[PDB]
Homo-oligomer: A and B are copies of this chain.
Protein backbone atom coordinates (compact mmCIF):
# COMPACT_ATOMS: atom_id res chain seq x y z
CA UNK A 1 0.00 0.00 0.00
CA UNK A 2 2.85 2.35 -0.89
CA UNK A 3 2.19 5.75 -2.44
CA UNK A 4 3.53 6.11 -5.99
CA UNK A 5 2.19 9.04 -8.04
CA UNK A 6 2.80 9.81 -11.70
CA UNK A 7 2.03 13.04 -13.54
CA UNK A 8 2.49 13.31 -17.31
CA UNK A 9 3.20 16.68 -18.87
CA UNK A 10 3.51 17.92 -22.46
CA UNK A 11 7.20 16.96 -22.66
CA UNK A 12 8.02 15.49 -19.23
CA UNK A 13 6.80 13.03 -16.60
CA UNK A 14 7.06 13.64 -12.85
CA UNK A 15 7.15 10.23 -11.17
CA UNK A 16 7.18 10.28 -7.35
CA UNK A 17 7.25 7.40 -4.91
CA UNK A 18 7.15 6.78 -1.18
CA UNK A 19 10.77 7.02 -0.03
CA UNK A 20 10.11 5.29 3.32
CA UNK A 21 10.97 1.59 3.32
CA UNK A 22 9.50 -0.41 6.16
CA UNK A 23 9.74 -3.68 8.07
CA UNK A 24 6.52 -4.38 10.02
CA UNK A 25 5.92 -1.28 12.21
CA UNK A 26 9.48 0.02 11.70
CA UNK A 27 10.46 2.63 9.11
CA UNK A 28 13.83 1.09 8.23
CA UNK A 29 14.86 3.87 5.84
CA UNK A 30 13.56 7.33 4.97
CA UNK A 31 15.23 7.69 1.55
CA UNK A 32 14.61 4.32 -0.14
CA UNK A 33 14.43 4.92 -3.90
CA UNK A 34 11.30 3.00 -4.88
CA UNK A 35 11.44 4.36 -8.44
CA UNK A 36 13.32 1.94 -10.69
CA UNK A 37 15.23 3.34 -13.66
CA UNK A 38 14.83 0.37 -15.99
CA UNK A 39 16.38 2.43 -18.79
CA UNK A 40 17.94 5.87 -18.97
CA UNK A 41 14.57 6.91 -20.44
CA UNK A 42 12.14 4.95 -18.23
CA UNK A 43 11.59 5.23 -14.46
CA UNK A 44 9.25 2.61 -12.98
CA UNK A 45 7.69 3.64 -9.68
CA UNK A 46 6.64 0.50 -7.81
CA UNK A 47 4.22 0.03 -4.91
CA UNK A 48 4.35 -3.31 -3.14
CA UNK A 49 6.46 -5.44 -0.87
CA UNK A 50 10.02 -4.15 -1.07
CA UNK A 51 11.29 -7.58 -2.09
CA UNK A 52 8.75 -8.10 -4.86
CA UNK A 53 9.31 -4.57 -6.14
CA UNK A 54 13.10 -4.97 -6.12
CA UNK A 55 13.04 -8.35 -7.87
CA UNK A 56 10.55 -7.20 -10.51
CA UNK A 57 12.51 -3.97 -11.07
CA UNK A 58 15.77 -5.87 -11.50
CA UNK A 59 14.15 -8.36 -13.88
CA UNK A 60 12.62 -5.59 -16.00
CA UNK A 61 15.82 -3.51 -16.03
CA UNK A 62 17.88 -6.56 -17.00
CA UNK A 63 15.43 -7.39 -19.78
CA UNK A 64 15.47 -3.79 -21.06
CA UNK A 65 19.27 -3.77 -21.11
CA UNK A 66 19.26 -7.20 -22.76
CA UNK A 67 16.91 -5.89 -25.46
CA UNK A 68 19.17 -2.86 -25.93
CA UNK A 69 22.24 -5.08 -26.28
CA UNK A 70 20.77 -7.98 -28.28
CA UNK A 71 19.25 -5.51 -30.74
CA UNK A 72 20.93 -2.18 -31.28
CA UNK A 73 17.69 -0.38 -30.41
CA UNK A 74 16.14 0.71 -27.13
CA UNK A 75 12.59 -0.25 -26.21
CA UNK A 76 9.94 2.40 -26.70
CA UNK A 77 7.67 3.49 -23.87
CA UNK A 78 4.72 1.65 -25.40
CA UNK A 79 6.89 -1.39 -26.14
CA UNK A 80 8.37 -1.37 -22.63
CA UNK A 81 4.94 -0.77 -21.10
CA UNK A 82 3.49 -3.76 -22.92
CA UNK A 83 6.54 -5.88 -22.04
CA UNK A 84 5.91 -5.07 -18.37
CA UNK A 85 2.24 -5.85 -18.95
CA UNK A 86 3.16 -9.22 -20.48
CA UNK A 87 5.43 -9.95 -17.52
CA UNK A 88 2.66 -9.11 -15.04
CA UNK A 89 0.07 -11.10 -17.01
CA UNK A 90 2.37 -14.12 -16.92
CA UNK A 91 3.08 -13.60 -13.22
CA UNK A 92 -0.51 -13.15 -11.96
CA UNK A 93 -1.62 -16.53 -13.31
CA UNK A 94 1.62 -18.30 -12.27
CA UNK A 95 3.90 -16.93 -9.52
CA UNK A 96 2.41 -13.42 -9.23
CA UNK A 97 4.49 -10.28 -8.78
CA UNK A 98 2.42 -8.31 -6.25
CA UNK A 99 3.60 -4.91 -7.50
CA UNK A 100 1.49 -2.02 -8.79
CA UNK A 101 3.59 0.29 -10.95
CA UNK A 102 3.64 3.61 -12.76
CA UNK A 103 5.94 3.47 -15.78
CA UNK A 104 7.11 6.97 -16.73
CA UNK A 105 9.18 7.13 -19.90
CA UNK A 106 10.35 9.75 -22.36
CA UNK A 107 11.31 8.51 -25.84
CA UNK A 108 10.73 11.81 -27.59
CA UNK A 109 7.18 11.84 -26.19
CA UNK A 110 6.21 11.75 -22.51
CA UNK A 111 4.44 8.58 -21.41
CA UNK A 112 2.89 7.52 -18.10
CA UNK A 113 1.41 4.05 -17.74
CA UNK A 114 -0.81 2.75 -14.93
CA UNK A 115 0.26 -0.87 -14.40
CA UNK A 116 -0.88 -3.25 -11.68
CA UNK A 117 0.11 -6.66 -10.35
CA UNK A 118 -2.62 -8.26 -12.46
CA UNK A 119 -1.39 -6.56 -15.62
CA UNK A 120 -3.77 -3.72 -16.48
CA UNK A 121 -1.84 -1.35 -18.76
CA UNK A 122 -3.24 2.14 -19.36
CA UNK A 123 -1.52 5.28 -20.58
CA UNK A 124 -2.58 8.04 -18.19
CA UNK A 125 -1.99 11.80 -17.94
CA UNK A 126 -1.71 11.26 -14.18
CA UNK A 127 -2.30 8.44 -11.76
CA UNK A 128 -1.19 6.70 -8.62
CA UNK A 129 -0.77 3.26 -7.10
CA UNK A 130 -1.44 2.60 -3.44
CA UNK A 131 -4.11 4.40 -1.49
CA UNK A 132 -2.59 7.74 -2.55
CA UNK A 133 -4.65 7.72 -5.75
CA UNK A 134 -7.76 8.15 -3.61
CA UNK A 135 -6.15 11.39 -2.43
CA UNK A 136 -4.28 12.66 -5.48
CA UNK A 137 -6.46 11.90 -8.50
CA UNK A 138 -8.98 14.56 -7.53
CA UNK A 139 -6.26 17.16 -7.01
CA UNK A 140 -4.93 16.34 -10.46
CA UNK A 141 -8.45 16.56 -11.85
CA UNK A 142 -8.88 19.84 -10.02
CA UNK A 143 -5.56 21.40 -11.01
CA UNK A 144 -4.17 19.70 -14.13
CA UNK A 145 -4.20 21.82 -17.29
CA UNK A 146 -3.12 20.60 -20.71
CA UNK A 147 0.21 22.12 -21.64
CA UNK A 148 1.19 22.33 -17.97
CA UNK A 149 4.65 23.81 -17.53
CA UNK A 150 7.35 21.83 -15.77
CA UNK A 151 7.25 24.28 -12.86
CA UNK A 152 3.45 24.04 -12.70
CA UNK A 153 3.90 20.28 -12.96
CA UNK A 154 6.25 20.26 -9.97
CA UNK A 155 3.76 22.44 -8.08
CA UNK A 156 0.92 20.02 -8.87
CA UNK A 157 2.96 16.96 -7.90
CA UNK A 158 3.94 18.74 -4.68
CA UNK A 159 0.25 19.44 -4.03
CA UNK A 160 -0.59 15.76 -4.57
CA UNK A 161 2.21 14.58 -2.28
CA UNK A 162 1.16 17.14 0.34
CA UNK A 163 -2.36 15.71 0.13
CA UNK A 164 -0.90 12.24 0.69
CA UNK A 165 1.02 13.55 3.70
CA UNK A 166 -1.94 15.40 5.20
CA UNK A 167 -4.95 13.15 4.58
CA UNK A 168 -3.52 9.63 4.21
CA UNK A 169 -3.43 7.96 7.63
CA UNK A 170 -0.19 6.14 6.80
CA UNK A 171 1.54 9.31 5.66
CA UNK A 172 4.85 8.60 3.90
CA UNK A 173 7.68 10.26 5.79
CA UNK A 174 8.88 11.61 2.44
CA UNK A 175 8.80 11.18 -1.30
CA UNK A 176 11.42 10.75 -4.00
CA UNK A 177 10.39 12.63 -7.15
CA UNK A 178 12.08 12.04 -10.49
CA UNK A 179 11.71 14.10 -13.66
CA UNK A 180 11.71 11.94 -16.79
CA UNK A 181 12.35 14.20 -19.78
CA UNK A 182 14.58 14.51 -22.85
CA UNK A 183 17.53 14.73 -20.44
CA UNK A 184 16.67 11.43 -18.77
CA UNK A 185 15.59 10.61 -15.23
CA UNK A 186 16.80 13.26 -12.77
CA UNK A 187 15.91 13.13 -9.08
CA UNK A 188 14.42 16.42 -7.89
CA UNK A 189 13.18 18.00 -4.66
CA UNK A 190 9.74 19.65 -4.57
CA UNK A 191 9.71 22.47 -2.01
Q: Which residues of B contact A134 (CB under 8 A)?
A: 25
Q: Which of B26, B131, B166, B167 contacts A167 (CB 8 A)?
A: B26
Cα of A165 to Cα of B168 in the assembled complex, Å: 15
Closest Cβ of chain B: how far from A32's Cβ, in Å?
A: 13
The size bracket of the interface on A is 10 to 19
1/0 contact string of A155-176 vs chain B (CB within 8 Å):
0000000000111111101000
Q: How far is the CB of A122 from chain B (nearest CB, A)?
A: 23
- Bound together, the chains give a CA A1 to CA B167 distance in angstroms of 18
Q: CA–CA, A30 to B163, complex, Å? A: 13
Query: Is the CB of A22 closer than 8 A to any CB of chain B?
Result: yes
Contacts of A165 in B (CB 8 A): 173
A66 within 8 A of B: no
CB within 8 A of A170: which of B25, B131, B166, B167? B25
**CA–CA, A25 and B27, complex, Å:** 18
The 23 listed contacts between A and B (C-beta, < 8 Å) are: A20-B169, A22-B169, A24-B169, A25-B131, A25-B134, A25-B168, A25-B169, A25-B170, A26-B167, A26-B168, A26-B169, A27-B166, A27-B167, A27-B168, A27-B169, A27-B171, A30-B166, A165-B173, A166-B173, A169-B170, A170-B170, A171-B171, A171-B173
Report A's interface with B, CB cutoff 8 A: 20, 22, 24-27, 30, 131, 134, 165-171, 173
